[PDB]
Amino acid sequence: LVRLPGLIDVHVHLREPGGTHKEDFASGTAAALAGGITMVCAMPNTRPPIIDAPALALAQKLAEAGARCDFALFLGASSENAGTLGTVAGSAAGLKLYLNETFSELRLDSVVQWMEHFETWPSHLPIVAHAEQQTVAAVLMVAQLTQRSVHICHVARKEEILLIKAAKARGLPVTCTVAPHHLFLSHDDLERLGPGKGEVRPELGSRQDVEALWENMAVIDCFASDHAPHTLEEKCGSRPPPGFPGLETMLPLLLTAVSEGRLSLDDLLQRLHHNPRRIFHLPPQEDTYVEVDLEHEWTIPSHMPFSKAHWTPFEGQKVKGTVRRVVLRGEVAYIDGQVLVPPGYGQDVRKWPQGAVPQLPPS
Amino acid sequence: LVRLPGLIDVHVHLREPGGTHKEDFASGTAAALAGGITMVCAMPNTRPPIIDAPALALAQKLAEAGARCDFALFLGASSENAGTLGTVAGSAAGLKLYLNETFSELRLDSVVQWMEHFETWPSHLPIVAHAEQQTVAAVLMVAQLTQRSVHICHVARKEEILLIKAAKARGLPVTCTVAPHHLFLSHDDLERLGPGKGEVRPELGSRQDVEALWENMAVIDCFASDHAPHTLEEKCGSRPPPGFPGLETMLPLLLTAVSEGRLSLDDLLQRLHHNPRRIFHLPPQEDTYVEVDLEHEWTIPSHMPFSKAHWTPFEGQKVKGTVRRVVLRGEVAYIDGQVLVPPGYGQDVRKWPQGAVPQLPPS
Ligand SMILES: NC(=O)N[C@@H](CC(=O)O)C(=O)O
Ligand SMILES: NC(=O)N[C@@H](CC(=O)O)C(=O)O
Ligand SMILES: [Zn+2]
Ligand SMILES: [Zn+2]
Ligand SMILES: [Zn+2]
Ligand SMILES: [Zn+2]
């Protein structure tokens, strides 16, 4: 067995409030623990969406009562809320901008609206953007015009990682995350998945996109699942929403890659622990660790045990490595397929004294 | 009468070679002279497209034999020609990038291809981009990464002009052009035009887009027609190509605006003479001038006399101001509805000693 620190997934969709047949805080954080994850950051594209103080207050209580691991909640940018989030901004994981079409009603239709958010959101707090292809260059321009940093979530294309690489070479403050489906799946998999299951944003890339991401691993700051649960009925239906569940498969896939020498254990810990902490200013978790077994070989089944999504695009993949035990803040939280902490054990890390983002005092 | 210097239209499509039922050098430059224009820069989206030395050589001869006014020819960026244009680059007006869907096969599908052109095209030579909405921010980012300037053609939206305004305020080297249809037409006109005639890229904007362009006139560097002739049969057909003819209506519309006090005569001369010269390094034309009459009131007819397009989206608009006489290099070129210089009178200004772009000698 190997002992790892508590891993952090900075990009999950837990569907509560409003989509709880797909997942809720209790089921989604159970999936997190089973995947060796002890802290999650939940996206705001719920129903109602987390785009104002009252929606945030509601989500916070739902999470505090339902979460089994620790968490922070993102606020979402809308066409109406720029300049209105200053009072609650510090209590959120960060601000999420949806800049392309995806499972969300929050798309901003004008770059001027992006600028307004970059100008009004506190400068010391994280901004994350769903930005695909040329949109990555556009949001980078807005970040430069407003003189601040931006984080690009789920980078999926050779085009995108090479653009980010060029920006870092010029010293621009940009960081990025890559999700496991964009490292381990490609167009070649759509035959097997079909057009419904295969729907995700950004879409699965070519083999060349996948190869470019591996070749440019040094450019990738974080891994995150983009856990996006939808039921099989929805994925197989007439208007399939995009997204894959992934909390329970992420670490097993990456541990397999480690065992094959495609990256080191440190590469993994930088991207699932240290970089998430430092980019999102997330606090340490006392007495918290994950024990993995690197020798157990298994095949991913048609669905993982915990997520309500009840399906997985990785069905049939051979992996080596499994999560054996998770201890969270001194309590056994997970052992071999059984979660052992109840809904509500998890806490909002932004309310911990060490979880606040340091800022310069009033002028 | 008022005497103006020779006006320059930096963005015309003359359709030769390959689309000569829509327009050719002879008919298109006749339309230019009638519109008070003595020098045009022709775009490369012809058939074959001007994307290599042999296509350029062909277009140059066709222009030299057919043009009635002076001209320069753009090269077009393709997915294959980056790094191959150095030998002929200096003979072109500049390099044109097509970054969105429009009447062209030259769209570049990856921002990496944009970067390659910005890195390989000589740094002292003009680059123009068809870039809409967020694409404006994206190409600006590529210009910054490669540390050079870019010119944005046909700006049509409040979103775009405000982005450019913000970039100029930060001292970024960007310039832009606005076409008359985006100052004088809007959504409100689509009722009258219909869905076929009304097809253009960028599409007609809202009244708010139009108002934003007028309010931000100080941000606009050039006016150009984006003369994009297609026959009525094509515009009224099942797959209408986008674009308006505009060489013969541009100056009359702008002179009307001058007479109404919406801008000054100087505002007009900066944008149709001085700024085109300095951004594209176009040479002066000896013994060349345009005489306009600011008092004659008339209504734009169903088609203007010269363009083969044989239709106009400005039909029915009341204008005040008309071109009475054009002298080009010491010859009467146009009087009151009659062109008096033959096809081939016009010359390639990039072959004039004063028409070369100054550059630092070899290292
Ligand atoms: N990526 C997806 O395909 N879906 C995500 C939304 C998102 O991350 O854009 C979801 O919330 O379902
Ligand atoms: N603007 C248009 O609607 N059409 C132009 C092309 C262009 O300028 O994009 C054309 O060549 O027809
Ligand atoms: Zn997303
Ligand atoms: Zn997401
Ligand atoms: Zn264009
Ligand atoms: Zn054009």
Swiss-Prot record, chains A, B:
Upregulation: Transcriptionally repressed following hypoxia by HIF1A.
Documented effect of changing residue 130 to A: Abolishes dihydroorotase activity
Stated consequence of mutating residue 130 to N: No catalytic activity
Impact noted for substituting residue 11 to A: No zinc-binding and no catalytic activity
Comment field (misc): GATase (glutamine amidotransferase) and CPSase (carbamoyl phosphate synthase) form together the glutamine-dependent CPSase (GD-CPSase) (EC 6.3.5.5).
Family (UniProt): In the N-terminal section; belongs to the CarA family. In the 2nd section; belongs to the CarB family.
Protein name as catalogued: Multifunctional protein CAD
Originating species: Homo sapiens
Residue window of the full protein shown: 1461 to 1823 of 2225
